[PDB]
Amino acid sequence: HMKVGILIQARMGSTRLPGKIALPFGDTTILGFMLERLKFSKFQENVVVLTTEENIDDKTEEIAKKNGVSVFRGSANDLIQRYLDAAKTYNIDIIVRLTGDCPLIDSKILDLMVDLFLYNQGRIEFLTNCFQRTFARGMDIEIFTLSLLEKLDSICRLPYEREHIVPYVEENTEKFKFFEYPNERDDSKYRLTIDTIEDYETLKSCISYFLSKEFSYVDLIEVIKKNPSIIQNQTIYH
Ligand SMILES: [Cl-]
Ligand SMILES: [Mg+2]
Protein backbone atom coordinates (compact mmCIF):
# COMPACT_ATOMS: atom_id res chain seq x y z
CA HIS A 1 0.00 0.00 0.00
CA MET A 2 2.86 2.45 0.76
CA LYS A 3 4.70 4.29 -2.00
CA VAL A 4 8.43 4.64 -1.29
CA GLY A 5 10.27 7.54 -2.93
CA ILE A 6 14.03 8.16 -2.99
CA LEU A 7 14.21 11.97 -2.91
CA ILE A 8 17.72 13.33 -3.45
CA GLN A 9 18.39 16.97 -2.67
CA ALA A 10 21.16 18.42 -4.82
CA ARG A 11 22.17 21.87 -6.02
CA MET A 12 25.07 23.57 -7.78
CA GLY A 13 25.22 26.41 -5.26
CA SER A 14 26.02 24.09 -2.37
CA THR A 15 27.40 25.67 0.79
CA ARG A 16 30.57 23.58 0.62
CA LEU A 17 32.44 23.24 -2.68
CA PRO A 18 29.78 24.80 -4.94
CA GLY A 19 29.72 23.00 -8.31
CA LYS A 20 30.88 19.67 -6.92
CA ILE A 21 27.87 17.68 -8.14
CA ALA A 22 28.94 18.49 -11.73
CA LEU A 23 32.58 17.46 -11.23
CA PRO A 24 33.91 14.68 -13.49
CA PHE A 25 33.69 11.34 -11.70
CA GLY A 26 34.39 8.03 -13.39
CA ASP A 27 32.81 8.25 -16.83
CA THR A 28 30.13 10.66 -15.58
CA THR A 29 29.56 13.38 -12.94
CA ILE A 30 29.48 13.15 -9.14
CA LEU A 31 25.67 13.28 -9.15
CA GLY A 32 25.35 11.03 -12.21
CA PHE A 33 27.51 8.40 -10.51
CA MET A 34 25.16 8.50 -7.50
CA LEU A 35 22.10 8.07 -9.70
CA GLU A 36 23.70 5.08 -11.46
CA ARG A 37 24.35 3.48 -8.05
CA LEU A 38 20.74 4.05 -7.00
CA LYS A 39 19.48 2.36 -10.19
CA PHE A 40 20.32 -0.92 -8.42
CA SER A 41 17.80 -0.26 -5.62
CA LYS A 42 14.61 -2.27 -5.64
CA PHE A 43 12.98 1.18 -5.17
CA GLN A 44 14.77 2.80 -8.13
CA GLU A 45 11.69 3.66 -10.20
CA ASN A 46 10.69 6.48 -7.81
CA VAL A 47 13.99 8.36 -7.64
CA VAL A 48 13.52 12.13 -7.85
CA VAL A 49 16.22 14.80 -7.78
CA LEU A 50 15.03 17.81 -5.78
CA THR A 51 16.89 20.99 -6.69
CA THR A 52 16.24 24.76 -6.84
CA GLU A 53 14.63 27.00 -9.44
CA GLU A 54 17.81 29.03 -9.90
CA ASN A 55 19.27 29.09 -13.40
CA ILE A 56 22.50 27.42 -12.26
CA ASP A 57 20.54 24.30 -11.39
CA ASP A 58 19.60 23.81 -15.01
CA LYS A 59 22.83 21.80 -14.78
CA THR A 60 21.36 19.65 -11.97
CA GLU A 61 18.19 19.10 -13.99
CA GLU A 62 20.35 18.20 -17.02
CA ILE A 63 22.32 15.60 -15.06
CA ALA A 64 19.14 14.06 -13.63
CA LYS A 65 17.49 13.95 -17.05
CA LYS A 66 20.55 12.32 -18.64
CA ASN A 67 20.12 9.56 -16.05
CA GLY A 68 16.38 9.16 -16.66
CA VAL A 69 15.14 10.23 -13.23
CA SER A 70 12.48 12.79 -12.38
CA VAL A 71 13.24 16.31 -11.22
CA PHE A 72 11.47 18.63 -8.80
CA ARG A 73 12.54 22.29 -8.72
CA GLY A 74 11.52 24.25 -5.64
CA SER A 75 12.63 26.22 -2.61
CA ALA A 76 16.34 26.96 -2.31
CA ASN A 77 16.58 27.18 1.51
CA ASP A 78 13.31 25.67 2.76
CA LEU A 79 14.07 21.98 2.36
CA ILE A 80 11.01 20.99 4.38
CA GLN A 81 8.88 22.76 1.77
CA ARG A 82 10.91 21.32 -1.12
CA TYR A 83 10.52 17.76 0.22
CA LEU A 84 6.88 18.24 1.16
CA ASP A 85 6.07 19.69 -2.29
CA ALA A 86 7.87 16.80 -4.01
CA ALA A 87 6.33 14.08 -1.83
CA LYS A 88 2.82 15.38 -2.45
CA THR A 89 3.52 15.85 -6.18
CA TYR A 90 4.62 12.22 -6.54
CA ASN A 91 2.16 10.78 -3.96
CA ILE A 92 5.03 9.51 -1.79
CA ASP A 93 4.14 7.94 1.57
CA ILE A 94 7.64 6.87 2.72
CA ILE A 95 10.44 9.36 2.03
CA VAL A 96 14.02 8.14 1.63
CA ARG A 97 16.01 11.34 2.10
CA LEU A 98 19.45 11.45 0.45
CA THR A 99 21.75 14.34 -0.40
CA GLY A 100 23.89 14.76 -3.48
CA ASP A 101 27.16 14.82 -1.57
CA CYS A 102 26.95 11.04 -1.06
CA PRO A 103 27.94 9.73 -4.51
CA LEU A 104 29.01 6.25 -3.25
CA ILE A 105 25.70 5.55 -1.48
CA ASP A 106 25.03 1.79 -1.39
CA SER A 107 21.61 0.73 -2.65
CA LYS A 108 21.73 -2.53 -0.66
CA ILE A 109 21.95 -0.65 2.64
CA LEU A 110 19.15 1.66 1.52
CA ASP A 111 16.95 -1.33 0.62
CA LEU A 112 17.60 -3.11 3.92
CA MET A 113 16.66 0.03 5.83
CA VAL A 114 13.47 0.49 3.84
CA ASP A 115 12.59 -3.19 4.40
CA LEU A 116 13.05 -2.74 8.15
CA PHE A 117 10.86 0.40 8.08
CA LEU A 118 8.06 -1.29 6.11
CA TYR A 119 8.11 -4.42 8.30
CA ASN A 120 7.37 -2.26 11.37
CA GLN A 121 4.65 -0.07 9.84
CA GLY A 122 3.10 2.01 12.60
CA ARG A 123 5.88 1.40 15.12
CA ILE A 124 8.47 3.51 13.26
CA GLU A 125 8.07 6.92 11.70
CA PHE A 126 11.76 7.88 11.45
CA LEU A 127 14.72 5.59 10.71
CA THR A 128 18.28 6.93 10.37
CA ASN A 129 21.80 5.52 10.11
CA CYS A 130 23.47 8.88 10.67
CA PHE A 131 22.44 10.11 14.12
CA GLN A 132 24.74 7.75 15.91
CA ARG A 133 27.40 7.22 13.23
CA THR A 134 28.95 3.82 12.54
CA PHE A 135 29.06 3.98 8.72
CA ALA A 136 31.59 6.12 6.90
CA ARG A 137 30.40 9.65 6.26
CA GLY A 138 28.66 9.64 2.90
CA MET A 139 26.41 6.61 3.49
CA ASP A 140 23.78 8.79 5.21
CA ILE A 141 20.20 7.57 4.86
CA GLU A 142 17.11 8.91 6.60
CA ILE A 143 13.64 7.43 6.12
CA PHE A 144 10.44 9.00 7.39
CA THR A 145 6.71 9.09 6.72
CA LEU A 146 4.96 11.90 4.93
CA SER A 147 2.99 12.29 8.16
CA LEU A 148 6.18 12.96 10.15
CA LEU A 149 7.36 15.50 7.56
CA GLU A 150 3.99 17.28 7.84
CA LYS A 151 4.40 17.46 11.62
CA LEU A 152 7.85 19.01 11.13
CA ASP A 153 6.41 21.49 8.61
CA SER A 154 3.80 22.46 11.20
CA ILE A 155 6.20 22.62 14.15
CA CYS A 156 9.47 24.07 12.85
CA ARG A 157 9.95 27.79 12.25
CA LEU A 158 13.70 28.20 12.63
CA PRO A 159 15.71 28.58 9.42
CA TYR A 160 18.19 25.93 10.57
CA GLU A 161 15.25 23.52 10.98
CA ARG A 162 13.69 24.36 7.59
CA GLU A 163 17.04 23.90 5.85
CA HIS A 164 18.10 20.60 7.46
CA ILE A 165 14.66 19.02 8.11
CA VAL A 166 15.69 16.51 10.78
CA PRO A 167 17.28 18.60 13.63
CA TYR A 168 14.09 18.80 15.68
CA VAL A 169 13.73 14.99 15.48
CA GLU A 170 17.35 14.38 16.48
CA GLU A 171 17.15 16.66 19.52
CA ASN A 172 13.70 15.41 20.63
CA THR A 173 13.92 11.69 19.84
CA GLU A 174 11.63 10.68 22.71
CA LYS A 175 8.83 12.61 20.95
CA PHE A 176 8.86 10.37 17.84
CA LYS A 177 8.82 6.71 16.86
CA PHE A 178 12.57 7.04 16.30
CA PHE A 179 14.98 4.22 15.44
CA GLU A 180 18.57 3.84 14.31
CA TYR A 181 20.35 1.46 11.98
CA PRO A 182 23.93 0.38 12.83
CA ASN A 183 26.88 -0.74 10.77
CA GLU A 184 28.41 -4.06 11.78
CA ARG A 185 31.60 -2.28 12.90
CA ASP A 186 32.53 1.34 13.53
CA ASP A 187 33.65 2.89 10.21
CA SER A 188 32.86 6.49 11.16
CA LYS A 189 36.56 7.43 10.95
CA TYR A 190 36.24 7.26 7.15
CA ARG A 191 34.93 10.29 5.28
CA LEU A 192 33.34 9.47 1.94
CA THR A 193 31.21 12.56 1.41
CA ILE A 194 32.27 15.37 -0.94
CA ASP A 195 32.73 18.79 0.63
CA THR A 196 36.39 19.54 -0.24
CA ILE A 197 38.89 18.94 -3.02
CA GLU A 198 40.61 16.43 -0.73
CA ASP A 199 37.31 14.51 -0.44
CA TYR A 200 37.09 14.50 -4.24
CA GLU A 201 40.64 13.14 -4.60
CA THR A 202 39.85 10.42 -2.05
CA LEU A 203 36.63 9.44 -3.82
CA LYS A 204 38.37 9.44 -7.19
CA SER A 205 40.94 7.03 -5.79
CA CYS A 206 38.17 4.82 -4.34
CA ILE A 207 36.31 4.20 -7.56
CA SER A 208 39.56 3.45 -9.41
CA TYR A 209 39.74 0.04 -7.67
CA PHE A 210 36.41 -1.15 -9.05
CA LEU A 211 35.55 -2.02 -12.63
CA SER A 212 31.86 -1.05 -12.43
CA LYS A 213 29.65 1.13 -10.23
CA GLU A 214 27.99 -1.89 -8.59
CA PHE A 215 30.51 -2.38 -5.76
CA SER A 216 29.13 -2.59 -2.23
CA TYR A 217 29.93 -0.48 0.83
CA VAL A 218 31.80 -3.34 2.51
CA ASP A 219 33.87 -3.93 -0.66
CA LEU A 220 34.82 -0.25 -0.51
CA ILE A 221 35.91 -0.30 3.14
CA GLU A 222 37.94 -3.46 2.52
CA VAL A 223 39.74 -1.83 -0.41
CA ILE A 224 40.47 1.27 1.71
CA LYS A 225 41.77 -1.00 4.48
CA LYS A 226 44.07 -2.76 1.99
CA ASN A 227 45.14 0.53 0.34
CA PRO A 228 45.20 3.07 3.20
CA SER A 229 46.70 5.75 0.90
CA ILE A 230 43.35 6.03 -0.88
CA ILE A 231 42.42 8.33 2.03
CA GLN A 232 43.54 11.87 1.09
CA ASN A 233 41.10 13.90 3.24
CA GLN A 234 42.55 12.67 6.55
CA THR A 235 46.08 12.10 7.80
CA ILE A 236 47.13 8.44 7.43
CA TYR A 237 49.20 6.87 10.24
CA HIS A 238 50.97 3.50 10.10
CL1 LIG B 1 19.93 21.36 -1.93
MG1 LIG C 1 26.40 17.27 3.21
Automatic annotation (TrEMBL):
Keyword Nucleotidyltransferase: yes
UniProt keywords, alphabetically: Metal-binding, Nucleotidyltransferase, Transferase
This protein's GO CC annotations: cytosol
Keyword Flavoprotein listed: no
Residues that, per the record, bind Mg(2+): D101
GO molecular function: metal ion binding; nucleotidyltransferase activity
The name this protein goes by in its record: Cytidylyltransferase
